[PDB]
Amino acid sequence: AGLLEGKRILVSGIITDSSIAFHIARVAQEQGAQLVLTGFDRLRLIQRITDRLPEKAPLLELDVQNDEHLATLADRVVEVIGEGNKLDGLVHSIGFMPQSGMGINPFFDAPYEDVSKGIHISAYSYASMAKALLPIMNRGGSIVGMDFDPSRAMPAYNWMTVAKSALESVNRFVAREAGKYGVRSNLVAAGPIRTLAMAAIVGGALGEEAGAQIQLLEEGWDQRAPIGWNMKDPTPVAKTVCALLSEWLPATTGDIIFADGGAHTQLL
Amino acid sequence: AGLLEGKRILVSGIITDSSIAFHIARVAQEQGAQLVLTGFDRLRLIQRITDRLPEKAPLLELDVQNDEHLATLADRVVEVIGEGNKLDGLVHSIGFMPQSGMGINPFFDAPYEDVSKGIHISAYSYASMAKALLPIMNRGGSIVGMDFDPSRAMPAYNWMTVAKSALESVNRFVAREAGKYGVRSNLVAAGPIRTLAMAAIVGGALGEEAGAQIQLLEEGWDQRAPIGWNMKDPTPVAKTVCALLSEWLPATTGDIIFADGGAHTQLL
Amino acid sequence: AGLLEGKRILVSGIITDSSIAFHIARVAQEQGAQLVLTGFDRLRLIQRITDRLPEKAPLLELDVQNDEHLATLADRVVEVIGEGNKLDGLVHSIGFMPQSGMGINPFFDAPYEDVSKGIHISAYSYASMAKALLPIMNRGGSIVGMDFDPSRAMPAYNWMTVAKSALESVNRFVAREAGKYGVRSNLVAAGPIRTLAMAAIVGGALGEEAGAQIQLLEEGWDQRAPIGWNMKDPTPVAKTVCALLSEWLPATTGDIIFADGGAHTQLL
Amino acid sequence: AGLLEGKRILVSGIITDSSIAFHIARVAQEQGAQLVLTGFDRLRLIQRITDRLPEKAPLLELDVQNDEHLATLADRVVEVIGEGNKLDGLVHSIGFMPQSGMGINPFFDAPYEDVSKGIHISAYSYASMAKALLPIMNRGGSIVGMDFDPSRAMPAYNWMTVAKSALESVNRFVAREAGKYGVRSNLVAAGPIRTLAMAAIVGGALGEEAGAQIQLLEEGWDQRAPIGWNMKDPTPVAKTVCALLSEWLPATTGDIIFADGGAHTQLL
Secondary structure, eight states: OOTTTTOEEEEOOOSSTTSHHHHHHHHHHHTTOEEEEEEOSOHHHHHHHHTTSSSOOOEEEOOTTOHHHHHHHHHHHHHHHOTTOOEEEEEEOOOOOOGGGSTTSOGGGOOHHHHHHHHIIIIIHHHHHHHHHGGGEEEEEEEEEEEOOOSSBOTTTHHHHHHHHHHHHHHHHHHHHHHTTTOEEEEEEEOOOOOHHHHHHHHHTTTSHHHHHHHHHHHHHHHHOTTOOOTTOOHHHHHHHHHHHTTSSTTOOSEEEEESTTGGGBOO | OOTTTTOEEEEOOOSSTTSHHHHHHHHHHHTTOEEEEEEOSOHHHHHHHHTTSSSOOOEEEOOTTOHHHHHHHHHHHHHHHOTTOOEEEEEEOOOOOOGGGSTTSOGGGOOHHHHHHHHIIIIIHHHHHHHHHGGGEEEEEEEEEEEOOOSSBOTTTHHHHHHHHHHHHHHHHHHHHHHTTTOEEEEEEEOOOOOHHHHHHHHHTTTSHHHHHHHHHHHHHHHHOTTOOOTTOOHHHHHHHHHHHTTSSTTOOSEEEEESTTGGGBOO | OOTTTTOEEEEOOOSSTTSHHHHHHHHHHHTTOEEEEEEOSOHHHHHHHHTTSSSOOOEEEOOTTOHHHHHHHHHHHHHHHOTTOOEEEEEEOOOOOOGGGSTTSOGGGOOHHHHHHHHIIIIIHHHHHHHHHGGGEEEEEEEEEEEOOOSSBOTTTHHHHHHHHHHHHHHHHHHHHHHTTTOEEEEEEEOOOOOHHHHHHHHHTTTSHHHHHHHHHHHHHHHHOTTOOOTTOOHHHHHHHHHHHTTSSTTOOSEEEEESTTGGGBOO | OOTTTTOEEEEOOOSSTTSHHHHHHHHHHHTTOEEEEEEOSOHHHHHHHHTTSSSOOOEEEOOTTOHHHHHHHHHHHHHHHOTTOOEEEEEEOOOOOOGGGSTTSOGGGOOHHHHHHHHIIIIIHHHHHHHHHGGGEEEEEEEEEEEOOOSSBOTTTHHHHHHHHHHHHHHHHHHHHHHTTTOEEEEEEEOOOOOHHHHHHHHHTTTSHHHHHHHHHHHHHHHHOTTOOOTTOOHHHHHHHHHHHTTSSTTOOSEEEEESTTGGGBOO
């Protein structure tokens, strides 16, 4: 019997097998959970990736910018988990910022049209997925979103930092709504993880001043972290998400749990 | 000789004579500053209000959602302050959230179209005004924006809280850009102030559960504040903004100064 | 197989069966841990209390103000857990402030002799127990201390708040030392719990202005908490400590996990 | 007419002319304040230093660990400022930690006897000086203490960091007491300043791993600071203290104002 034995958990954000959500899903399945996965735009390709998980899982279409997708999401989840059954967990691992909003592009040069798209997908969608799925979540359930500590500004991350600040605020309000259902809402602030998306930004900064800053920024995490930080090892972050999905943190909500090696508690 | 003697300061956000920006402008003029004011959509009506300031000041049109207005703002400021002169200060006091995003309306029922408009006007515009005006600001200058502490969620303020969280993050990045010009960027987190806009929200909540919560929320500020809090007295907040516009906090930037009676430092 | 199956965990702070440490110990044993308990001054009486735990556990004398007790603690733990075995966990649940430092007594009237004793027992001892026991802790181990959020001042808690602020700082430095051993160090910031010690303070404030403030303070936790707060139910806090003692938060150190119903994330 | 024209301000902490308090005193006098200075143990030598201030000022003996000195302090201040006059400001700039508590000495090797002395002088004395002097402070007055941001641990600063965490908590409680008198209480968190005391620690770490860490730590402040940081220039910090002593931040209390170049708002 695993940490999440029999728990029904919806997991968003699986883009490649380097996605944090891929490893969250893997660990959750290793711990006995029954998953429902979401994706958009690349469904056949996503299924080829999710086939590499230890267990099978239904894959549902969800464009969080599509009101009709959100309006039918709960009904479509019930179709695959069965009449009279509800979700015990919801994992929000979708974060996106157009290219103008990150990397080597100057902070002032991101048009609001791009920033708005990023905040829609990265922050507002945490509330709209909770709105859609709380009516079919079980008392004692858990909503977990992925965060990257935006309390201090930093090179390159730029408007994605702003979107994470917005997400942290949204999480505190989602917690107020989720509490009416006996459901917790929390974020996991992870250290840097080498996803293909982040690698594309870092790679596109090679030889530029932003890339020098990014290198110093990344190297600082492992240095600051009293237990170190491995950007190529997403498993400690996935385990932390599963901790919040379990009932072992039953009095924590509206909150932020740091899975960052302790880096954010140290100046050097 | 006053605190801001001879300093040229652009002040946005004067809607009525209850606006915080009205009192910022008044105190700045009492302290010797030469002001440039901005407004949109009600220019003849705004001039009738700004006539009630102690000193005359040019009034320039600025819709922060209008790219052309922003593209010409610096040129139009130079037209009124004179060739070869620059601004010493910039006051951002524009905050707006459509009705769906505040008050008695449920948090989950605000469409993103409304939230996005509020974040554009309340948070992104802090960066786009800095982008427009830093090229004509003097070394040692000061950009100040108005904040309402969003670190903890609260009834009724809803998506405006999210917009303020975004603004705090934007301020930290504006500080990085402003530093290249020798310019500071800070926010003043004020206690609640009875503007006509906030009074309309509070008034529209009378008899509803949100209005009960708002009353308890407001009454808590004066109780928590070790020196009290008067929601009808914006002068302590205006003086604090003028402190940041002066050169008496010359090593503070990217930061948040609380003008709230100390309420946020006390639980009860 | 439980969450802490076979883990050897030292638990301090069991004074009565209302002590948080009593419930931490109970849940840890329910989850398969093998405990070593500490106490001072009332050893026969403490054994009568610890007899009421589900499983037997050795009880060792430890006055944290006694240098000789600390100098021999590791040797005495090895005597009871066996040659070649080490601890996997350390629970610090000792907090004490003389009567002058809490309750109805004015903040300014606590002599430093009393404040110093409280900070010795409540904060410095977290470092000195880590100093004594890290040499006999296993890689992947976990040190957990009990906290009460001191980020904002509050009535009655007075110098105990100051001692908790000191403890939070000590924890961040203990994490730097513990990391060299592959050991994490964290605090759990709990909501208010009706221990006999806290009840004695609250009871001694009945009819006084501090007691009125304490009542409003306590009632605010359950109100603010989106999932509520029960001061008579220490189990959610005990489960949270066990979460940190497990390996399900393996990238968290130097940190503070809130087991408070989410109260600290909400203003009202 | 200067920022503090005619204000009577007591200034503690002048050890050498590199002391932050020396520059606070100088700027305050440049701004028209009338000062009362305190010192202990080196009074003839301190007078030779305070002679180098722009204006004369009485020097009073104050060992903050001496209860009799504190019991008579208000009477002795009145003796020099005159019957019926009161103080408008109080500057606390005394910070001390025995050698075992900082620098290259291991964190775990500081005996509590040393830590306790440091916390007495660095943190508790902020409350006991407020207790002594609030009865002779004017409504609208201001108490300011010196801080060094202890929210994240760092090399070498060790137990002095713990003492500053304690001080920040004490400040929030002093604000509750000071509010009854119409008096504000705040701290200024400065960036690193090359006092003779800090230089002795840094100098004693030359060639050791702690000295390498200290160098990286110091160099990071100017790098992180969007407006830079000069450790040899205490004037920006002194001006910030004078800002809080004035009436230009009249709604700020129990709080922390950062005079650090903005370094603490940036990760890199």
